[PDB]
Amino acid sequence: LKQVEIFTDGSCLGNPGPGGYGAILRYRGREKTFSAGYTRTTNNRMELMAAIVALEALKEHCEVILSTDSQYVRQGITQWIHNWKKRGWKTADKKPVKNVDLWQRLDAALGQHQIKWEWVKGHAGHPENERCDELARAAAMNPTLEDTGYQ
């Protein structure tokens, strides 16, 4: 009715190794699915990538409900991001925050929508989340992209 429901998941067969993400966008009683596999990446990077990819696909300012079970995204969002930004995206040793490339991308896109986060625990009772996992793993088996921001 104006809202966008987004479901995300990302994973790695071996870590670091081939990985992929799955994202489901529900905008106007029309589901949209996004999936891709990368030759060599990490778990944390795919979980972040899924959410980036989905927000970036909205070609307009929306009221979004984003559902993910990623502890990494959750912790960054609720606890670390505000401070990293105050600190110029570096840690106390003055090195760039890990996966800064991805974190900046997410921050930018979170700036363009009104987001409501749904932090999910477990696949049971969350069919869209499970499905993202299936997509994630299937992409990872036929990796086609390079994760060029990966160190």
Instruction: Give 136's strand partners.
Output: none
C-beta contacts of 115-119 below 8 A and 24+ residues apart: 115/64, 115/66, 116/63, 116/64, 116/65, 116/66, 117/66, 117/67, 117/68, 117/74, 117/77, 118/65, 118/66, 118/67, 118/68, 119/68, 119/69, 119/74
**How far is 34 from 19, CA to CA, in rounded Å?**
14
Domains of the chain listed by start with CATH number: 1-151 (3.30.420.10)
**How far is 84 from 15, CA to CA, in rounded Å?**
25
Query: Experimental method used, please?
Result: X-ray
Residue 31 annotated as binding site: no
Distance of CA 150 to CAs 43, 98, 119, Å?
11, 10, 26
Residue 93 annotated as binding site: no
State residue 44 phi and psi, 5-degree precision: -60, -45
Residues 6+ apart with CB under 8 A from 59: none
Structure tokens at 8: 């995300």
Cα 43 to chain center, whole Å? 11
Structure tokens at 141: 């088996």
Residue 29: Cβ-neighbour burial (10 angstroms; 0-12, 13-18, 19+): exposed
Resolution limit in angstroms? 2.0
Name the amino acid, one letter, at 107. D
Instruction: Give 90's strand partners.
Output: 96
Residue 101 annotated as binding site: no
Place of tokens 């401070």: 83
Known catalytic residues are 9-10, 47, 69, 123, 133
Residue 69 annotated as binding site: yes
**How far is 107 from 110, CA to CA, in rounded Å?**
5
State residue 75 phi and psi, 5-degree precision: -70, -45
Cα 147 to chain center, whole Å? 14
- Per residue, the 3-state secondary structure of the chain, as one string, reads CCEEEEEEEEEECCCCEEEEEEEEEECCCCEEEEEEEEEEECHHHHHHHHHHHHHHCCCCCCEEEEEECCHHHHHHHHHHHHHHHHCCCECCCCCECCCHHHHHHHHHHHCCCEEEEEECCCCCCCHHHHHHHHHHHHHHCCCCECCCCCC
State residue 22 phi and psi, 5-degree precision: -140, 135
Residue 129: Cβ-neighbour burial (10 angstroms; 0-12, 13-18, 19+): buried
Instruction: Give 145's strand partners.
Output: 38
Residues 6+ apart with CB under 8 A from 114: 62, 63, 64
